[PDB]
Amino acid sequence: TSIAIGSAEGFNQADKAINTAVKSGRWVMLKNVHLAPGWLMQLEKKLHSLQPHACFRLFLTMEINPKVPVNLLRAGRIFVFEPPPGVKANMLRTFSSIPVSRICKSPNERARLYFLLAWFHAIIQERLRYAPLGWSKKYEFGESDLRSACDTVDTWLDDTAKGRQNISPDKIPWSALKTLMAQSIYGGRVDNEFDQRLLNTFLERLFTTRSFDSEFKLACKVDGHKDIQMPDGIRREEFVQWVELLPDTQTPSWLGLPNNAERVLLTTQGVDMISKMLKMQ
Amino acid sequence: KELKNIHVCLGGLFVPEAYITATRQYVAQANSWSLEELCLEVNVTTSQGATLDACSFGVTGLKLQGATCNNNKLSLSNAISTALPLTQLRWVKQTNT
Amino acid sequence: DVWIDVQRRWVYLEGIFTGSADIKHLLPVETQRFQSISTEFLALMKKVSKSPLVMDVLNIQGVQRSLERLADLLGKIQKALGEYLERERSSFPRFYFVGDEDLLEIIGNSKNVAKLQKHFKKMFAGVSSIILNEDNSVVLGISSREGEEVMFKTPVSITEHPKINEWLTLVEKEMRVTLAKLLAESVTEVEIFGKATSIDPNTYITWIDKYQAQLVVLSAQIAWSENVETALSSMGGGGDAAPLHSVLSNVEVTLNVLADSVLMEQPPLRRRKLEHLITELVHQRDVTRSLIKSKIDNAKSFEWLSQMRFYFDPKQTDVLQQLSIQMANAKFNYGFEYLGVQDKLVQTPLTDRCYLTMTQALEARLGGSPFGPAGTGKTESVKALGHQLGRFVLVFNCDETFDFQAMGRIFVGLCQVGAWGCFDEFNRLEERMLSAVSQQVQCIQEALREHSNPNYDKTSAPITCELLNKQVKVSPDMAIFITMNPGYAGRSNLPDNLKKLFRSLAMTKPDRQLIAQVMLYSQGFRTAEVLANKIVPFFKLCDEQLSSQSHYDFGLRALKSVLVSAGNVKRERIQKIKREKEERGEAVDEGEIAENLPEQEILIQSVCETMVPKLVAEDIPLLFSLLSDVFPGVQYHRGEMTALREELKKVCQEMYLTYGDGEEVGGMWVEKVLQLYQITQINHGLMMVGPSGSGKSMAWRVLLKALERLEGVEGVAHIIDPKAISKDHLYGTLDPNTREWTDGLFTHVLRKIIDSVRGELQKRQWIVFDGDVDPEWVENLNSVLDDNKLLTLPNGERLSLPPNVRIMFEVQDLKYATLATVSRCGMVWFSEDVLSTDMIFNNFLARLRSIPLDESPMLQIQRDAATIMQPYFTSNGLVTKALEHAFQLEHIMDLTRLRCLGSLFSMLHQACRNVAQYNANHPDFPMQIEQLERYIQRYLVYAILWSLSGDSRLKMRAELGEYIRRITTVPLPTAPNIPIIDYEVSISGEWSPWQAKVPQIEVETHKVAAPDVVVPTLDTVRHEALLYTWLAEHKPLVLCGPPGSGKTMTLFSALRALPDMEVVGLNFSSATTPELLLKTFDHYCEYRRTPNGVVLAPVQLGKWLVLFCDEINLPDMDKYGTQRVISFIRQMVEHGGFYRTSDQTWVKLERIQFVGACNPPTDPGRKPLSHRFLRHVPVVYVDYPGPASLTQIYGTFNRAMLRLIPSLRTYAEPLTAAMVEFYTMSQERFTQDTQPHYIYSPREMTRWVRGIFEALRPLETLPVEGLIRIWAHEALRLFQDRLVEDEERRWTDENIDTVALKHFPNIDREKAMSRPILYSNWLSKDYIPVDQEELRDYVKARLKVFYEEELDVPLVLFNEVLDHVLRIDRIFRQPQGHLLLIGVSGAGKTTLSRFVAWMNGLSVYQIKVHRKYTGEDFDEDLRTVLRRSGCKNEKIAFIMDESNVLDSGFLERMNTLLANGEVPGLFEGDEYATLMTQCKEGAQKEGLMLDSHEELYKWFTSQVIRNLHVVFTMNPSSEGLKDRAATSPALFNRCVLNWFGDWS
Ligand SMILES: Nc1ncnc2c1ncn2[C@@H]1O[C@H](COP(=O)(O)OP(=O)(O)OP(=O)(O)O)[C@@H](O)[C@H]1O
Ligand SMILES: Nc1ncnc2c1ncn2[C@@H]1O[C@H](COP(=O)(O)OP(=O)(O)O)[C@@H](O)[C@H]1O
Ligand SMILES: Nc1ncnc2c1ncn2[C@@H]1O[C@H](COP(=O)(O)OP(=O)(O)O)[C@@H](O)[C@H]1O
Ligand SMILES: [Mg+2]
Fold it and tell me: Do A35 and C432 lie within an 8 Å CB cutoff?
């Protein structure tokens, strides 16, 4: 039972759902509980004096803001959700989120398109860490955009390949996918001419027939002369294994950025780590 | 007359876009052109070694991020920012080519 | 608790049943049940009314059981009626858009269909009314608001379908069917019009006229879609010769025909159809050109699939399914909703991106969220897309009152009808409410997704979702759209779970050059591309170059207003040319007229008529240079409105205003009036922005009168102060329990205009908002002041703005409004230079020469005085130069021209009244011209001095006097050093010093330092005269100065000379609202309904009421810089009344005036007063009396005091000197910088004299050392008790010793300065000094007795405890003596207070605060305390702790109680009657026979003042003390602060 906090009817529904689930064993999630800090005290008190079913679970989704009670934080287990820390981690999360049966479908090129989409999403989100340079403003490139792009890829691949086991890379609707991702899915958030220019550059570079060649370069000159190579596999397992064997040497050049973009940020983060270690000596 | 030949720092002006509009308006009035049919072209030269014509205005303090300007041609660089010594803003008629 | 409910239920059920006479035919069984209930009600009516006594009717058996049975029956029938209403709404779901009472009216008036015509507008997109035969029995067709109509293929017969729901459903179905058939025929014809090398114009115009504006554009789009599809199919072979060029050529020739059509004159409907077709075909031509350039040869190419394509299949039987609309992979069926005639949007590269994104969202079964800045086409693009698919699009202007329930009802309506919901300004909801609404949105979207599955069949269970604990059928046609202006003020942040339910789209840069090119092209502008290429860069350069002002807007709302004005100007000029050709010649060739037409001149005229009025003085040359550069050579000269100028001349003459032409005096103001007239012509939403006193109100009033006399249309103005009332009272409230909507002020006014019961639609109605603008209240008017012209309420009601109504705002700045409000209104900028000072002088002199002051010899005196004052009231005159100099001095308040001018004018009116009084006192010898001249000149100088420097200190007054002496020629006093400010003007016409009015008096020994005693001082005699002058004119005024300066003493001394004025004390705090003033009005005034309106006047006839506001600048400013109470008072002073929110009735004040007092606005917690409020209130600065004045005031008090002991007669002067010196050093040493409560004023000097007098009164004799001991004891108690640090106490003690030995050298130091200076009347009868050990023994014995009868907590006695109990006992023995004990908890404050109260015979009352304690409980405890102390004459020590303050209302009530001794709003209703009875018996017991309520309440207030003592204990917080210094200002000037602190 999913309940969104904020209204009195919401509190009544939450109380009823919790009272029913602690006996029946259902799950209950209350969303945006940070909007009712006063009610969180009562919820914690209610939970403490309780012996619920073995399978009962209570999920409380909230934004990270100081209004959340300390006692509720201590009483429950905290799970911080945030952008994945790097291209490799982002692509691993993307491949874990999408079900296996969806990627492995009638056209064998669907797995390659999903891999290209995962790489594009990882590159797009990782540039956000460099706010003035990677983009012009902190856009909210999130899971909704990735799901919409996956839906678009599925729909247009199904339309172009009527159940055929194989479709030619030229026959793939590249223009449809690029235009939709630059106009509706990812380009909707973009309100800048130059950010739109950058998004179009990335989409025309990644989503093309040449991406199915064996010599395709996902990112050129990532460090000196070395460059990222497109996987030559055709199955989801091959792409996932390529992601897992990615080097742990990510630099801004993977994103197309100069390698000096992270110097100031890394220095500030190191100083902040020193200050945090000293703060709790 | 002297206000045309002084190199301004666009970062030191309260409204630099008003300065760009004022220079455009000066060029349009001087040559009896129309404002809407004027385009801008930029020529980066040395501050001392430069000549300002009737349509060129000098601007200082412009910093180029992630690129270098040599002979008015751009090249990528690993420097965070490269200073442009003197930027000349020339207003010319639109060509639509 | 049952009779009232049953009575109400029967009343409204009887109203429903009787009003709807046809409800019985369709609700039979409950009609019979209510018939029986009505018979029972009639039996009750005939039984209970026979005996009009409660006892006579409760003794009758069978009444309560029958009452319960009737309650159950009424509840059951109400539930049955509600269930019937829901069931009837299930069929024909369009009833979800009308109210419950509206639905009942529809039910009861099914027989007569004339009443049904006013409800079709809100149940249909464009159906204004239905078309009926003469019999009114068959529905022929429907009509739009523009008059356009569609005739049904098969008319719907009401006789064959008598039930309302059945024939309404048939009407809707037949609407859809007939639109489908008409579209089929129109498509068949336009297909012939297609694939043609040439088009006959006559046939094309015939086809355009035949069909509706919707269907012609739809058919054109269809035919073009099949043409392009066929051409691409031909090219699908690969390499085939392109027939797409043929499609482009066909589009171009049809566009040529349409463009030639718009030059010549057309009927307005056919003109609008031509404009729509021009826009559509321009879009089609652009798309075809793009297809040709891209070399598209496949119909499956995305360059064609991305476009919107129409596929018409008339063969299919279903009405919705003949036409299919497809964009990319999204497929929609045309809804065939009659949309009337809408305004079409140029489809630009952003309305094409918006269409694509929103259709992709729709195909994903989740909403769309176009976002961006203001004026980007977000709402209009959503509406245009909805109209493109033929959907019913409902626009809602969201605000914080759109709670979970209101949004739930709206969603239920949209789900059942199958309509699109555009929720604009959606982030204006509360964040919690957005979070709650996300659940409903998610449920609806899940219902849509489960509907979309192929497994679902329409023959299976209908698709439903849980909305508001009910299963609601979800139509697949539903859509939800939200448009948000992110980062704007007054907007909330959407929860992240809500944002994933919408597909956002940034709409930030509309393609303005295309909208202008297409808009000018469709209006008949030859060379529209050149005009667009000039006008869009012009707006960009205006935005870049012009200065940044809060009211500037150069966006698409400005282009669109400029382009519309350009079209109107072109039409007007064509008509003028036709008339001129009629005057000279006969040949009227429209082609030649259009050929030789100055279109650039027309565009410049529109720009000047729309953009120039808002420009500030320094920006006008910039915009005119931009115009002369963008449009070189083209010049425009404004056409004179000669008739309007004449009519304005007459209005200004009758209103005593100055009129001018061009560069004449008043020319700028008349130009501004004409600009306001033009902006009124082009805009339906208006703002008059400009500094206070710039002429805005006079501008629009004169314009309204001139328009009434010029056009013959009566002008009605409704002026509303939007911020003087709560937004709930401004727009209305929806009851959370019964869902009952109560109209606000603006809502009631607009609904009254729309109803037009008294012909309000035939009059020019202007709704003026004269007040501050913030995004909280003004953004509810976003749908009103837009192109929707609609007010949407949370209860689902929508009120269309009539075309004769103008919404006008008269503001002084727009610094808090967002760009969403600024962009929707036409600005007129009134600089202060518009209203020159000469114009104000002329207005004053005209009113003086015309309007008599008494209500004629008085008018003759006024005319003579005006003739005398004329030379000085000229430009570059004495008054002008003095005002210019006065602006260079520094005043206690921000000086404004009109405040000084109003003060001066009122003072001159008082001079005229003085001359009239002199004439009345000398009937034999009236004042001659020479004496009048001398008096008027000298009084003019005196009034200039007191009006231009009254609110400034002595130095600035002297400077202004010196400047006036330098510049003037009026005779002035010849004294070499005495300033002119120290002189008055005798009625004989000569300067006389104020010191002649200051006599050295001898106060009676029993009136020493009494509250009503004022030693005459030069400043007192001057300020009293000034206050008399301002009060006698009933002018509002403000006294400013340090606390204790003597502002209230001066006001009460001046009011003593005015016997017909009664003052009422109001103490404002930071939580003050207009509710305090309203309670004062309820207590002291009464409302009477005169034939002219409702009038609020004091209860006592013939007496003027003065509302004295003690701290007028304390009330908190909201986050938008507005004090609501100050706005309320400014409304009551400007317009002479206010709005009663009970029934939205304008109440006019009578015999009520306002006087304010305040500390300087630079003091902590004090806010500067508004310039619009300060314009009407003169300010007088009352400063602290200086050492000479202090020596004079307290020297008289000490001389009066020391007459008690004749042996001490010689010590008055040194005693007063010591008092003044120590007070001065204490004031210099301890300032408010250190601690907030370190405020020292002459009030302490008075408490000093009073304390020494009370300690000296009973003694028969006393040595000098005893006098010094009393002096030092009072000095310690007044200057050392409030000190925090021990260093301050040590300094105070040492300097007390120093001063005492300095001014009294030959005294015994030890016998007078023995450090434990203790005085007590506990051991003896008198207040003689007490020793520490005997006092300790006495306190020990009394503490033993205290333990025996009261609290048994043992206490340890140390010297500080003895000091503290003596200090508390001092306060408990004084009238209105309140304590403020500050110290750490557990220090003994409450116990010592209780113990001392026990000694003094004071009852201890403490409020029992708990978790459920609220405001009403505190009010009841206050009522109990007040009744005990006042009515029963009981001495009570009201001990209250800061922890008991659970709300700011407690502190507000305690502030009023502590200051006044009575809370005006505490006793109201039956409680007031009981209190008044008890006061009657109490006064009888005391021995006073009082009858009237006024004198009883005065006695009650005096008793509460004498008896009630309030002890307030708090911890010594740093910021808490500062907070309380503003939340409860009476805690620091009515209480006696004692700093206990921690134990040393
Ligand atoms: N044309 C005029 N000639 C002479 N006096 C005028 C004229 N117009 C206004 N006044 C007077 O000058 C003063 C300006 O007040 P007005 O009501 O016009 O200002 P306002 O713009 O409404 O200012 P506020 O914002 O304080 O209401 C008033 O005393 C008004 O009567
Ligand atoms: N001429 C005077 N005669 C008598 N008292 C005076 C005089 N001038 C000042 N005072 C004293 O100044 C104080 C002013 O108190 P109040 O009228 O409440 O001032 P405010 O309204 O400025 O707070 C009183 O103690 C009053 O007795
Ligand atoms: N001089 C004292 N001797 C003994 N107990 C004291 C003394 N002063 C305070 N107390 C203690 O203070 C407590 C009561 O607190 P109270 O005086 O009501 O607090 P507050 O000073 O905050 O108003 C009792 O326990 C009492 O014994
Ligand atoms: Mg909008």
Answer: yes
